[PDB]
């Protein structure tokens, strides 16, 4: 359509930069929980972070420290299921395509 004055490609942030931002956010949340979002990034084991977040929803720490392997397996299976569902479904991205 670049034939009647339609000049369209001024993205300020390249897709690589946005991916870098997302990766930085992922690393911060994984290695520091919510601390990096409110000040200095404080490290904490991911199991202890999950225990903190279980306490956030009103569940004691001991449940995670007793079912850690089961919870990790469930999380990994859920992530794999999300990847499979996205791959096998074309209408998942309906909003951006619209």
């Amino acid at each position: 359509q670049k034939f009647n004055g339609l000049t369209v490609l001024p993205p300020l942030l390249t897709d690589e930069m946005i991916a870098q931002y997302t990766s930085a956010l992922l690393a911060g949340t994984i290695t520091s929980g919510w601390t990096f979002g409110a000040g200095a990034a404080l490290q904490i084991p991911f199991a202890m972070q999950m225990a903190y977040r279980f306490n956030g929803i009103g569940v004691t720490q001991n449940v995670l420290y007793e079912n850690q392997k089961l919870i990790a397996n469930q999380f990994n299976s859920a992530i794999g299921k999300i990847q499979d569902s996205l791959s096998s479904t074309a209408s998942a991205l309906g909003k951006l395509q619209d």
């Binding site: 942030l13 930069m17 290695t31 520091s32 490290q43």
Partner: protein, 263 residues
Amino acid sequence: KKFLPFQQFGRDIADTTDAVRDPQTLEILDITPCSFGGVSVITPGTNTSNQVAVLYQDVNCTEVPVAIHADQLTPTWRVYSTGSNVFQTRAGCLIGAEHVNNSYECDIPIGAGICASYQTSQSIIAYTMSLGAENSVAYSNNSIAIPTNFTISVTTEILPVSMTKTSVDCTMYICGDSTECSNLLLQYGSFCTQLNRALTGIAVEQDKNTQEVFAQVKQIYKTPPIKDFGGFNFSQILPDPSKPSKRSFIEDLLFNKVTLICA
């Protein structure tokens, strides 16, 4: 692209010619617009500098010298049309800005991850923006960082709440005390009433916005005459009775710092 023997023209999805067969030889030639594009001026404020850079959008740096030139004011425009400091980016051609391999925080966004800054004698430099300072959390499965101190941080967030409640009389604006013009406008129906209703609704909406934002308290509370809050000082935010307007120091500063509409 290979045309069929009987095919002459070629059109895209927008129904615009973009291919034609040469009448002499059976060969197909594409058709594209040559330049189009726009010229933007990147500049630090007139303060601290007067030199500038020119960005020609969606054009190759080879075609810039002929892009509306050869008739411009020669001595001062050829410098920004050719010469050194020619950089090609996804945004287009940049003239007068020196490309730098370093990466700093974006100052003047050019586009496609490219920005420009006046800092270094001094000259305009184009670089790739740095998303931030690289960091690596010392993550270990049995190590935790605990704060041994804290800081009380006060930050400002400014939010507009209302606009000027402007009402424009459609009849007067279109027709200035002209009987003939008003009679002619009467033939157009109720457009004036629609516009007046829209403007009145906008004004009422501004009033409602102010009321909702600020009228959140039913009582009018007052601070004690003696202000002993355990060492905390709110003078900068509490109203000052000395000034004619009973408004705090920061409130007065904000009012002064913002600046004929009746003209």
